[PDB]
Design a protein around this ligand. Structure first.
Ligand SMILES: CCCCCCC/C=C/CCCCCCCC(=O)OC[C@H](COP(=O)(O)OCCN)OC(=O)CCCCCCCCCCCCCCC
Ligand SMILES: CCCCCCC/C=C/CCCCCCCC(=O)OC[C@H](COP(=O)(O)OCCN)OC(=O)CCCCCCCCCCCCCCC
Ligand SMILES: CCCCCCC/C=C/CCCCCCCC(=O)OC[C@H](COP(=O)(O)OCCN)OC(=O)CCCCCCCCCCCCCCC
Ligand SMILES: CCCCCCC/C=C/CCCCCCCC(=O)OC[C@H](COP(=O)(O)OCCN)OC(=O)CCCCCCCCCCCCCCC
Ligand SMILES: CCCCCCC/C=C/CCCCCCCC(=O)OC[C@H](COP(=O)(O)OCCN)OC(=O)CCCCCCCCCCCCCCC
Ligand SMILES: CCCCCCC/C=C/CCCCCCCC(=O)OC[C@H](COP(=O)(O)OCCN)OC(=O)CCCCCCCCCCCCCCC
Ligand SMILES: CCCCCCC/C=C\CCCCCCCC(=O)OC[C@H](COP(=O)(O)OCCN)OC(=O)CCCCCCCCCCCCCCC
Ligand SMILES: CCCCCCC/C=C\CCCCCCCC(=O)OC[C@H](COP(=O)(O)OCCN)OC(=O)CCCCCCCCCCCCCCC
Ligand SMILES: CCCCCCC/C=C\CCCCCCCC(=O)OC[C@H](COP(=O)(O)OCCN)OC(=O)CCCCCCCCCCCCCCC
Ligand SMILES: [Cu+2]
Ligand SMILES: [Cu+2]
Ligand SMILES: [Cu+2]
Ligand SMILES: [Cu+2]
Ligand SMILES: [Cu+2]
Ligand SMILES: [Cu+2]
Lengths: 382, 382, 382
């Protein structure tokens, strides 16, 4: 939730999430779900979004209904912010543990500093069980195993209640006497010195000394109880390993790209050159989490969110085997209610009417090439 | 105009504009002139100029004597700011349309954010005709063809005059009575409440209600008249395609570079190694829009501004065919009044006495190699 | 001095200084000492240190006990700040001239803007002689040879004394009369106009006119005496040539890296793959200026500061010739008091417990390969 309201061109021109898998659709409490996939950083990064020099891989959900057990970018655990390069592709994996029952829309997201949220496709996952069964065991380097759900709760309650009680007692010591009107009149009359006695001064001195001594003793006792402590671990982790992918033996030029403004579709003229890899055929156009597929060339079998999957939303004028070398100019039409449901038609309000997306080409043997396209998008009103 | 006053080293060390062409020297009104060329970004970019992450290709002229019909960087239209990389070469093309008659010095420039203006060579172009014949037709996506010279002029005049008249009427309603002295005396005397009557309150209420209602009705009518509107299109366009140029089979090292301070020339010792490409010969040294040529090796036939063209300003101690492999140390002398006219001799006031420029080598067949040189420049006073 | 107090991980993860040489250990006054070596910029640059876009090569010493005659980065003189790229290796050379007698700990350092100091290994150098024998001759472009120790000293003294005397005379002219109490009483009594006479006004006018005229005449005389002047030369020098080094035919993966917190050592599990270059053997681990060596494989003969040299501080479970192709998992133990002396054990207070260093592999013929390792460092308390 939160993507439909984001500018259409910003969603089109930031990060592209390609083949994704979810290990389970329905999980029990304390069971783990794995979300893996690839994300590509668009070369034409918008200028109002800072470069992903400081980026964090996040899980979009209405709260800690899951707990993120681990997250890996390129096989490396990433508990901190990371640095990503423009134009590179990265594998990502996220292992989550179920905490609260219910149906949850879970998304993979990249939070970018100086940019904001970049939400990926969301999937509905059902958690069955009771929240009381959730456990979060962690073993420390000191040899102690604790449960993070209730660890250190009683100590915090005790100390906060103790200090609150001390403050309440300090206020109530003075609250046993007339408070506001008689004291104000006495101060106005010049009898302020009569409002504080020697016993009050002794009580204040005792309160101050007891507070300081208790703080010192509590710090000493806490140090004795936990002689091994480390500061909070923070920093930006550089040197993320990107994917070394086969360059596309397929070249695609966008002649024109238009959308009818009333409109639930997008149309584009494309010149495609096959540089080998056998006769190929376009099977899918990915724009903003929406996948328009050509049923005759490719069929999704990964449980891609159906609200974002158009099984026959790709209409190519001529989708015949493009013999290696053939340069065919084709008119592709990406049509689906998701265009209007995911407010991609709101590119009419955007201060930049340019789109970007991914095209997937398959040969007879099923090998897939990914081609990256970007162009300006012209609205049609006649 | 405006380059002679810019620091000499800043002009030497920012952008180099090489082979340029102008389609016409004399044009009529509504006729188009094309300026094409190449620009190279110097690797040793000055630190006080921000990197050209946000750069705009501009035309330097005393105003809209021309209208910039289009501009292309690397074959791509660039109506917005663009991103350029240090050390890369780009083709540029600018098509302008003549608007006002007269002789105009036209320059190609790169405005760089956090840096300032980078002016290129200027050429004198004559426009013949009358300004009243200039037309700027534009066809909108709604099917309307308009002339940008006078489009929406009457509407703006009408609305501004209407609101100015309303304000004048509001002031003049109160201006029919004594204004300053009697009213001031009455307010001082305590008779302020007598200065505003019930009729005045009713008039003020009517003015407020009429203003609000007129604004609302005008907005509704404007929306009805123009139901299709888009916001201003802005942004920085990345992914500019640079030139893939042959690396210079010629290696040049600058041993020493000196200039006499009184002085109208510059001298340099150079070690040149030919790595193939047949016997070569230096034909031209480009510094800051000034081209020093060796008449025996090369002759300009592009109509390069004569104030910046020194046909025999390159004197090479030995400019004989440098057999592939020969490593000759030569003393080159670049001499021309342009050195003093374009205030390149003002490098003596610069907080950085280092120069940069381009050397052009030609073989027997006429093939040209471009070598890029940079060195510190030492003034000579004895 | 000043490195032991710097965070251990910051010292481990910034710049690595490898093979270094000092021309002399004991020098006389006016004699020169050359310090050469290589420095590598770590790829995982810490986020709290700005990238070395503006870096200066500096000499760490308690003052001008030496004078830095020259400094070269990649064979190019670097009197100004320079730009360095992450992940590149550079040669550096520094020629210093002895000025003051005594024993001096001299370090090579890289000052990085927005980062702070990066100190390299320090060496003790003895200077014998008298400071009065030190000379700093410099020949100007005007044909004058001067000594920078005493040049322009007398002129500065004369002008400062002259202006101070003028100010003292101005104060003392008024100081001959009663100063504070009688004047205050007269001003309070309303007799302020009697405290300044016409002669005082004439004296003030003469002082003002003389000051302005003297300033103008002094400027004119200084211009006449030195008709050739240049502004201060400043700027950041880009285009530093890095080393083109053989990629390591040796691959090393860090399985685990741990340190006992009481502790004077560090332990690591490593998987090493030989990709040719004959049977190899680990001979040295460089962490933070500390070099742990395996005496049986390599011996230092460069006079590396002994406080930072552990001749037998590298213990490899199996350090037998790793036949090209062999993938051996070995347990290496780097032990030395320098770990505690140079406060590398203070990584326990660091907000980032990750280390980086260099491994040196030698074959039978003595050829050396440098492998770069980085990992998180886990403290052991049991
Ligand atoms: C829950 C209260 C709201 C917020 C409390 C915030 C800070 C505390 C303020 C007052 C503390 C001192 C009590 C008054 C002097 C406590 C005090 O003096 O009690 C005797 C009073 C005074 O004697 P008197 O002049 O002969 O009688 C006048 C009132 N009948 O008599 C009483 O019968 C008791 C009345 C006082 C009861 C108020 C207690 C509520 C405060 C404790 C709340 C603790 C929880 C805090 C978080 C919400
Ligand atoms: C690092 C330097 C210290 C900071 C400088 C200021 C220090 C001030 C000193 C007092 C100067 C005022 C004159 C008072 C003369 C001595 C003095 O302390 O008198 C009591 C004064 C009231 O002043 P007075 O009676 O008119 O003074 C005349 C002689 N008694 O109250 C206080 O000082 C505050 C309340 C009583 C203090 C008891 C200790 C509790 C507070 C400290 C914590 C102790 C427990 C430590 C935990 C381990
Ligand atoms: C061009 C004027 C300069 C700038 C104007 C700026 C804002 C407007 C100020 C005054 C408007 C109300 C007029 C006075 C009450 C208009 C008004 O009350 O007119 C009757 C006056 C007053 O009657 P009275 O007391 O019996 O006579 C005294 C003056 N003789 O009599 C007149 O004979 C007319 C004199 C007033 C003429 C001034 C008009 C100029 C202002 C309109 C300019 C519009 C263009 C604006 C942009 C420049
Ligand atoms: C979103 C919330 C609204 C903002 C809150 C403030 C609103 C204020 C309300 C009035 C409170 C003061 C008491 C007045 C009582 C009602 C009232 O409006 O009285 C007239 C008052 C003068 O006060 P009064 O006579 O002593 O009031 C006693 C009873 N009449 O003048 C005004 O309110 C201003 C001038 C007359 C207003 C006429 C409408 C023109 C202005 C609004 C635009 C209407 C056209 C819309 C275009 C589509
Ligand atoms: C070294 C002094 C410290 C700093 C000086 C800073 C600025 C100068 C202040 C005073 C200058 C005017 C002198 C007084 C009027 C100089 C002046 O009027 O001298 C005659 C006085 C006054 O005559 P009187 O009323 O009959 O006698 C009263 C004092 N006996 O008599 C004297 O016997 C001389 C006393 C004055 C000597 C003070 C001189 C010190 C100042 C010069 C220092 C220069 C070095 C500067 C850097 C440190
Ligand atoms: C660029 C524009 C200049 C700045 C504008 C202000 C200039 C002010 C002028 C004076 C106006 C006040 C009326 C005084 C009338 C003329 C005048 O100068 O009178 C003397 C006034 C005192 O005023 P007054 O006697 O009541 O004036 C009545 C007629 N004399 O003192 C001063 O002006 C200051 C002290 C005397 C000046 C002598 C010259 C020394 C200062 C200047 C440097 C000269 C040497 C140059 C070196 C090459
Ligand atoms: C959450 C836990 C709540 C803690 C509650 C603590 C109690 C707080 C205040 C008690 C007020 C009694 C005032 C009696 C003066 C009532 C009073 O003033 O009585 C006259 C005495 C006469 O004493 P004397 O013998 O003639 O002279 C002194 C030596 N003999 O004067 C005084 O000066 C008596 C001073 C006594 C002050 C006691 C207050 C100390 C409170 C510290 C509390 C510590 C916090 C808890 C620790 C875990
Ligand atoms: C650029 C175009 C210029 C537009 C010029 C607009 C004219 C402006 C002001 C007229 C002043 C007349 C004042 C008469 C009070 C003169 C006045 O006060 O007369 C006494 C009346 C008595 O009226 P009554 O009948 O006894 O009671 C009300 C119901 N019957 O009192 C009032 O309260 C009369 C109020 C009348 C106010 C009229 C002003 C409205 C002006 C709106 C202009 C709209 C803008 C143009 C639209 C395109
Ligand atoms: C470090 C070097 C130190 C320099 C010391 C300079 C001496 C400073 C002040 C002298 C005070 C004498 C005051 C006499 C008034 C004492 C005074 O006021 O005497 C009455 C005269 C009467 O003169 P008169 O003839 O009747 O009228 C004028 C034409 N004839 O009035 C005046 O107005 C006299 C004005 C004389 C003022 C002289 C002060 C000029 C000082 C400039 C110094 C230059 C700096 C050094 C250059 C290298
Ligand atoms: Cu959602
Ligand atoms: Cu992409
Ligand atoms: Cu010009
Ligand atoms: Cu260049
Ligand atoms: Cu030291
Ligand atoms: Cu390194």
């Amino acid at each position: 939730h939160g993507e439909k309201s984001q500018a259409a061109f910003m969603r089109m021109r930031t990060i592209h999430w390609y083949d994704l898998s979810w290990s389970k659709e329905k999980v029990k409490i304390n069971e783990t779900v794995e979300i893996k996939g690839k994300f590509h950083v668009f070369e034409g990064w918008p200028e109002t979004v800072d470069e992903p020099d400081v980026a964090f891989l996040n899980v979009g959900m209405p709260g800690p209904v899951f707990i993120r057990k681990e997250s890996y970018i390129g096989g490396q655990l990433v508990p901190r912010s990371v640095r990503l390069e423009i134009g590179k592709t990265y594998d990502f994996r996220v292992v989550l543990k179920a905490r609260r029952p219910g149906d949850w829309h879970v998304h993979t997201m990249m939070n970018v500093q100086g940019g904001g949220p970049i939400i990926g496709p969301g999937k509905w996952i059902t958690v069955e069980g009771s929240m009381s069964e959730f456990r979060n065991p962690v073993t420390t380097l000191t040899g102690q195993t604790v449960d993070l759900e209730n660890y250190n709760e009683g100590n915090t309650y005790f100390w906060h209640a103790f200090w609150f009680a001390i403050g309440v007692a300090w206020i109530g010591y003075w609250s046993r006497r007339p408070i506001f009107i008689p004291r104000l009149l006495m101060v106005d009359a010049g009898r302020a010195d009569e409002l504080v006695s020697a016993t009050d001064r002794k009580v204040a001195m005792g309160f101050l000394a007891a507070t300081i001594l208790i703080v010192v003793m509590a710090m000493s006792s806490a140090n004795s109880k936990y002689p091994i402590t480390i500061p909070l671990q923070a920093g930006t982790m550089r040197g993320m390993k990107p994917l070394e992918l086969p360059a596309p033996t397929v070249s695609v030029k966008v002649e024109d790209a238009t959308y009818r403004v009333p409109g639930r579709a997008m149309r584009m003229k494309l010149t495609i050159t096959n540089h080998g890899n056998s006769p190929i055929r376009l099977g899918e156009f990915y724009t903003a989490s929406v996948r328009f597929l050509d049923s005759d060339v490719y069929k999704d079998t990964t449980g891609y969110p159906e609200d974002l999957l158009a099984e026959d939303g790709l209409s190519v004028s001529d989708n015949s085997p493009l013999a290696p070398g053939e340069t065919r100019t084709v008119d592709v039409t990406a049509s689906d209610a998701a265009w209007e449901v995911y407010r991609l038609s709101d590119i009419i309000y955007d201060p930049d009417s340019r789109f970007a997306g991914l095209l997937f080409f398959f040969d007879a043997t099923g090998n897939r090439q990914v081609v990256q396209i970007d162009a300006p998008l012209i609205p049609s009103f006649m």
